[PDB]
Amino acid sequence: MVRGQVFDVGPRYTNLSYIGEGAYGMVCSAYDNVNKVRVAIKKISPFEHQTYCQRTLREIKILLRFRHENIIGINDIIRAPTIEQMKDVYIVQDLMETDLYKLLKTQHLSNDHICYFLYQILRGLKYIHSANVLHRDLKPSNLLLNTTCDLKICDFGLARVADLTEYVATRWYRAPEIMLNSKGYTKSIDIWSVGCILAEMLSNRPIFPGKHYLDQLNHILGILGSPSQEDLNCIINLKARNYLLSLPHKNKVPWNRLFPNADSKALDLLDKMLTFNPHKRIEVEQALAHPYLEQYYDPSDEPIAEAPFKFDMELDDLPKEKLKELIFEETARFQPG
Numbered sequence: 001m002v003r004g005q006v007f008d009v010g011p012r013y014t015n016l017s018y019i020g021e022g023a024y025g026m027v028c029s030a031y032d033n034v035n036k037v038r039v040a041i042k043k044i045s046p047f048e049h050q051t052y053c054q055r056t057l058r059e060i061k062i063l064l065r066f067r068h069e070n071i072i073g074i075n076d077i078i079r080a081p082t083i084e085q086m087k088d089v090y091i092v093q094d095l096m097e098t099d100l101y102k103l104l105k106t107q108h109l110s111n112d113h114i115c116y117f118l119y120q121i122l123r124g125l126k127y128i129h130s131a132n133v134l135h136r137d138l139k140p141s142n143l144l145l146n147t148t149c150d151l152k153i154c155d156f157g158l159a160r161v162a163d164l165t166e167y168v169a170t171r172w173y174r175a176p177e178i179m180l181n182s183k184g185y186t187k188s189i190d191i192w193s194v195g196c197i198l199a200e201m202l203s204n205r206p207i208f209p210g211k212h213y214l215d216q217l218n219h220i221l222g223i224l225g226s227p228s229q230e231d232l233n234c235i236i237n238l239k240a241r242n243y244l245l246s247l248p249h250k251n252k253v254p255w256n257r258l259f260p261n262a263d264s265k266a267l268d269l270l271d272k273m274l275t276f277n278p279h280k281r282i283e284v285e286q287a288l289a290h291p292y293l294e295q296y297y298d299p300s301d302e303p304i305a306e307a308p309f310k311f312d313m314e315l316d317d318l319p320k321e322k323l324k325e326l327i328f329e330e331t332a333r334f335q336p337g
């Protein structure tokens with residue numbers, strides 16, 4: 001009953017309004033007749049692909065266990081009463097006004113707004129990393145804003161525990177380790193993404209907008225300069241590593257040349273986040289404690305996870321039929337009864 005596609009969420013949720021297709025499928029706003037407020041509803045139809053099933057179960061478990069101002073929650077989950085009938089799953093969340101991607105398309109951001117947004121992102125990320133979880137897909141369209149500049153991180157379908165050839169909408173925010181298919185990515189890949197987001201807030205355009213795979217690498221090298229052998233210390237393809245090390249030597253481009261009107265403190269922090277070497281890269285607590293964020297930084301008001309997150313049994317080894325069973329169990333609490 002929307003764009004020709006079924007969206008059965010009534011009778012509680014009425015007055016459907018199409019917002020847009022996303023990672024999982026159709027996203028609509030609806031009127032919650034119980035809470036007398038408009039909400040956002042994700043429709044997911046994952047049960048034919050093993051990876052989508054992973055993503056869905058990942059999203060549900062993470063978001064139901066996390067509790068933080070700067071992280072989207074899950075208000076309700078609608079699905080069929082029997083696992084046989086369950087084809088679609090509807091995830092109900094708070095309706096936000098927009099996301100950072102759209103915002104950066106139309107609006108210029110004051111230095112104080114950039115500073116505050118960055119703080120909220122890192123504050124949320126600090127909690128996520130405290131739960132021993134990597135987000136792995138941080139980007140402007142995954143950062144939601146409400147009417148009063150409150151920021152929430154969303155979409156944890158690609159999240160893993162801190163202990164890939166699938167389609168993604170953009171790779172402009174993926175760390176060099178990820179791009180080079182290394183086997184040992186840590187929490188620092190999220191930090192790299194935030195830096196990219198910081199740079200985009202400062203200029204309203206992406207810092208590394210590659211057209212294709214190898215072009216993505218060239219854009220990075222063109223700004224940061226040629227990587228050393230020590231920078232390329234991850235378990236990576238031997239031929240790909242030799243290729244990078246043989247590319248024309250690039251010098252590092254000064255940040256103030258790319259960002260002439262930016263706060264010098266913002267650029268110093270930006271320099272710490274966009275380091276090629278992951279082990280050189282600044283950590284989330286160190287970023288929060290950077291002078292640029294000093295007016296907001298307060299470790300007494302930055303909640304961490306009560307316990308490190310644990311998918312008690314490992315997930316990507318399970319048949320899609322077993323994952324469906326788990327999704328059914330995790331959503332049983334939201335059923336009438």
Ligand SMILES: c1cc2nc(-c3cn[nH]c3)cnc2[nH]1
Nearest residue numbers: 040093094095096097098099
């Ligand atoms: C959960 C996802 C979501 N998305 C939007 C949104 C994104 N762009 N425009 C609205 C608003 N509220 C939301 N709640």
